[PDB]
């Protein structure tokens, strides 16, 4: 049963704070509190603790990432830039 | 129901002022001060609590015999079994690969 129609998590703020501000807040809190896969153990056990620290409940492997996402889109190509830039040193 | 009072001179309830009321033999309710609770010793590598070691306040550890302060393993009262177990694996295998690194180096440079 879909209890709430369109505001979901941000509906806890009642009617205050406008509609777009709640909606824009709504978008980030969905992935801020979401469950991510771990690169070291491959489980749905990655959660955010503190600002920009992503820890894995199993195997205690903590991965540094974005303030609200494990891997922010603005920096996913940064390692792609480096990795593409590494091979020119060798070949 | 009888009501109790503080026996020390501090009138506020804190972690250092915990109070447990006990049934005194004289037939009255007396407040009995409880010391702060001990915390389990933790492994240095995995952070989890390590079993087999007595838990007590820090200074009072100087009185307990070594049977509650040292298991018969290597890294007795500092690491916990599994951390020691893989510490052996990491030490044994890397030294095993190090000589493998050395033998290949002696062969490639010789045939260079």
């Amino acid at each position: 049963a879909k209890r709430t129609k369109k505001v979901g998590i941000t509906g806890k703020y009642g009617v205050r704070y406008g509609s777009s501000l709640r909606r824009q807040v709504k978008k980030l809190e969905i992935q801020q509190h979401a469950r991510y896969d771990c690169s070291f153990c491959g489980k749905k056990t990655v959660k955010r603790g503190a600002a920009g620290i992503w820890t894995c409940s199993c195997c205690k492997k903590t991965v540094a990432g974005g303030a609200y996402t494990v891997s922010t889109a603005a920096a996913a190509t940064v390692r792609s830039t480096i990795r593409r830039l590494r091979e020119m040193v060798e070949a | 129901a009888q009501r109790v009072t503080f026996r020390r001179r501090n009138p506020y309830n804190t972690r250092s002022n915990k109070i447990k009321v006990v049934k005194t033999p004289g037939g009255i309710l007396r407040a009995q001060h409880v010391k702060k609770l001990a915390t389990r010793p933790k492994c240095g590598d995995c952070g989890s609590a390590l079993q087999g070691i007595s838990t007590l306040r820090p200074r009072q550890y100087a009185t307990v015999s070594k049977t509650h302060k040292t298991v018969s393993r290597a890294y007795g009262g500092s690491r916990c079994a599994n951390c020691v177990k893989e510490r052996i694996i990491r030490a044994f295998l890397i030294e095993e690969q190090k000589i493998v690194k050395k033998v290949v180096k002696e062969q490639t440079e010789a045939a260079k």
Partner: protein, 135 residues
């Protein structure tokens, strides 16, 4: 095929002798009524001989080259098999099923192993086995 032979050298990761190498005297792949698993009879050593130098002399050499062995049943899951091999052609009938329990007769097993390993430690024989593992 089966590389857990009767001369194999391994490392112990569980029990009191954690991090001390051993030599497999007799393997039991099919198990037994007691220890119903892949237990192994090892004769490794507990106290490693300290390093000796040219400055050391006479009594200060003999005491340093002292080895305290031990005999113990260990499961395969607590051992680290290697390709190394140690010469065990001395003590076939020393370590066996009757060697354990009634520990009074366990003593001579720990004595013949010490003297046999004492001889094998002199000169550059099995240098890796008698070197203390850093971990």
């Amino acid at each position: 095929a089966k590389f857990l032979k009767a001369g194999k050298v391994a490392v112990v990761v569980r029990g009191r002798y954690a991090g001390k190498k051993v030599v497999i005297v007799k393997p039991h792949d099919e198990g037994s009524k007691s220890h119903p698993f892949g237990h192994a009879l090892v004769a490794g050593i507990e106290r490693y001989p300290l390093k000796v130098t040219k400055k050391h002399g006479a009594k200060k050499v003999a005491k340093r080259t002292k080895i305290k062995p031990f005999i113990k049943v260990v499961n395969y899951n607590h051992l680290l098999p290697t390709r190394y091999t140690l010469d065990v052609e001395a003590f076939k009938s020393v370590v066996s099923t009757e060697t354990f329990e009634q520990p009074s007769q366990r003593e001579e097993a720990k004595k013949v192993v010490k003297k046999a390993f004492e001889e094998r430690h002199q000169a550059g024989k099995n240098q890796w086995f008698f070197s203390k593992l850093r971990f």
